[PDB]
Subunit: 336 residues, 3 copies
């Protein structure tokens, strides 16, 4: 169908780690689905010792919100760059065809907006990110990425074509940060975004992140802000990394069905311990919880997780199952 | 079935690179398979110039021994932490469901042991590793990991369901080491395990290993200690990396059938040159030897292999095959 | 069949990024396909500020030329090492079985040549590279690698066995370079190849490349030297990385069908945003162009691409398609 003649619908976005309400399988025909995002440059505290990032975001968050459509829909995004920002921006959708993903059609200076339409003709989770000419990696590593999820119109399927269904979706964006230090060994704090540029590029070129965080900060997905679920619930875990490889793992769980390359027309793999998200992509995993407790969800380079920040928690309610796992003898003195 | 009512069997473990005797396809029903491992902290010489590691091991070796069961069996491990060790330990089985892989149920101080049961309900090769709260990567990178192999009850299968069988299995654990240097440019030697901690964490955070070794040392799987096979023999090569990615390759061979993500319910890939083991996982490859000679088996980041240590040898006996490869003209002066 | 009795054919190689003329599906029976390559050591300018590399090449180029045969053919290579070179060399074909890929049969000192035959019995794209004992990574990272493509005799196929066909093939070799600096912070320029060795090995061991280039130089595949195509044309993009992982991406496009592990007997994946080439391998992607414009083809670690050099361009002629993508509103003042 010609998109100029199709019905339009508007979606209200929600902040990560939630995902806006949506259908999996649907009876709906194709639609032009309208979204708006507003760019916010801001200084953010990213660790427990007061380190700051001169950050750049879609809609005030790292990652930007997840956009959900169905295969055959059109995405119609209005991108707003308020006059309170200092830098130009744009958007590159890996789900889109042409014009550098849309970047060439969405160059907005402070004080400007633009509106882009494209056909979501391929199912999967896809990264979107900012990409302004001459300063592409800086904008990405400072926070400007998120996920577009294009569901098959009849929902997710296993390798045999059986239906898969989730009860809740969560979105995790992983950010390799390059925070400069000065000659006193302390991280630098900058008064403006532009002042941070040259020092940051030098750190970038070492390919060694200072921090690697989920969702904007060390510990972002812990404490009051842990993810939640119940025994018997099936969760979809969307994981994006716009710049650098990562290897997700659920401690005490599995990826029941995983699309590590993120593209739903391909059969998923089962029973994964650890999967692989290529830098520049988003992938997705399903898991049905079978045990209660506080799980960790992390990058299984354990230095990247525990030392640099790439780890969160999932607090799961319900009944413990001794068939799956039992403590036969608690820690006690070695028999003599 | 309820595991409390099932038959129990005990397995005697063997040191890497061998794997304890086991059946592939079996007529046996499900069993509770009992294993014991004893933790040993020890100083180890890891290279040819006398560099030492303040190491931590399951059963005295890097990697720990490979445990083999069949899908539907229960693993029942007694983990012993003798009073001669300095640190607490535990075990996280990626093949297990709940309680941080078993880590929350197996916290043993020096002088203690514990016994854990879990259902091996998913087929594949899975990492196990130590994971004590607050010092997880240190224990892993110091040597505390190995493999649990859960075979399908009817043995390994190709994508069409045809049986695959191996004559010999070998287990290779690859260890990214972070050995500190002092201001004189020499590697540090420490009198105790605890003394090595702070300096090691600083090296870890650079994400640059000093050494990357198979099976505990540069050259461990060479010389008298090379792997062996014969023309016509099919080998299973199990490869674990609990912390960091690697890319196995057999020089002059292939991966005939490879499960790089390590999970046997998924179809394998054929004819691989180089495969990929995600940090935090174990994978497996089958190869049938067709040529005699001394092969290398290595990580194909050739700096990681030849400069940092991630390489071994396979010495293969038998008859050379000129149909597969022939020297038509030996090195000689260029025709003039 | 016995290769000694088969017909012989000779192929004239062409320089990257082109690939010599060949058939996809063929009616031909198996042949011994004869090739010649001549090693050239040379100093090369690798960036826009005059940095030089003491380089080593097959046939004068980085990568070496792509060799194309069909499954069941024999490759018969004459490798020439002229007396004007300083170092010994050889070749390791990952497509070959035995004798360290052929390296043990092809050790040529300056002034020598050798001729190797092997059966191309496995379909796929495979790396070939130099590998002289005691200095393997140096020769690889200095430029000595390329691709052998072994096509199925009936051409490429999708997961259902439907024929896939390409109109043009391009070959991209990605090279992680380790150029030393002196105490003044400038890259070193060396009078001879041997003089560069010790300083380069020290840089290698840091695992941090100074540059990461396609086809021998920053910007090699840009400007006059961009790749070209037309709307409606299907291209095969062959990507080799003999030493280090990479993650190819087409900005504004996709991998329609991708063999990321590079082995054509395995089903490809569809709709990829970004794929993964393991260090020590070659992979391949098909794409049919649907939009005109100048695309980027790059490693999607965007620091590796935009800061270190791992990026090229594809200039595509034809008609813009507003159904796939349309600018609904050009950048303009934010409504008040
Ligand atoms: Cu931006
Ligand atoms: Cu991108
Ligand atoms: Cu431990
Ligand atoms: Cu783990
Ligand atoms: Cu060479
Ligand atoms: Cu190789």
């Amino acid at each position: 169908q010609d998109a100029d003649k199709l019905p339009h619908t508007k979606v209200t976005l929600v902040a990560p780690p939630q995902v806006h309400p949506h259908e999996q399988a649907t009876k709906s025909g194709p639609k032009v689905v309208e979204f708006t995002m507003t760019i916010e440059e801001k200084k953010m505290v990213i660790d427990d010792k007061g380190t700051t990032l001169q950050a750049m975001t879609f809609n005030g968050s790292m990652p930007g919100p997840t956009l959900v459509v169905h295969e055959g829909d059109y995405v119609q995004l209005t991108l707003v760059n308020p006059a309170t920002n200092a830098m130009p921006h744009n958007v590159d959708f890996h789900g889109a065809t042409g014009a550098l993903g849309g970047a060439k059609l969405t160059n907005v200076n402070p004080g400007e907006q633009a509106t882009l339409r494209f056909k979501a003709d391929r199912s999967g989770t896809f990264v979107y990110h900012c990409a302004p000419e001459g300063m592409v990696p800086w904008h990405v590593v400072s926070g400007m990425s998120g996920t577009l999820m294009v569901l098959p119109r009849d929902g997710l399927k296993d390798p045999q074509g059986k239906p898969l269904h989730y009860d809740r979706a969560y979105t995790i964006g992983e950010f390799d940060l390059y925070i400069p230090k000065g000659p006193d060994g302390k991280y630098k704090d900058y008064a403006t975004l532009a002042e941070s540029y040259g020092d940051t590029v030098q750190v970038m070129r070492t390919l060694t992140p200072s921090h690697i965080v989920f969702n904007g900060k060390v510990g972002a997905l812990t404490g009051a802000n842990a993810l939640t679920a119940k025994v018997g619930e099936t969760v979809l875990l969307i994981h994006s990394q716009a710049n650098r490889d990562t290897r997700p793992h659920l401690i005490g769980g599995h990826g029941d069905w995983v699309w590590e390359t993120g593209k739903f027309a391909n059969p998923p793999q089962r029973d994964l311990e650890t999967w692989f998200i290529r830098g520049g992509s988003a992938g997705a995993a399903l898991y049905t919880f079978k045990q209660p407790g506080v799980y960790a969800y992390l990058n299984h380079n354990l230095i990247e997780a525990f030392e640099l920040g790439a780890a969160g928690h999932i607090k799961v309610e319900g009944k413990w199952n001794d068939d799956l796992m039992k403590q036969i003898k608690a820690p006690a003195p070695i028999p003599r």
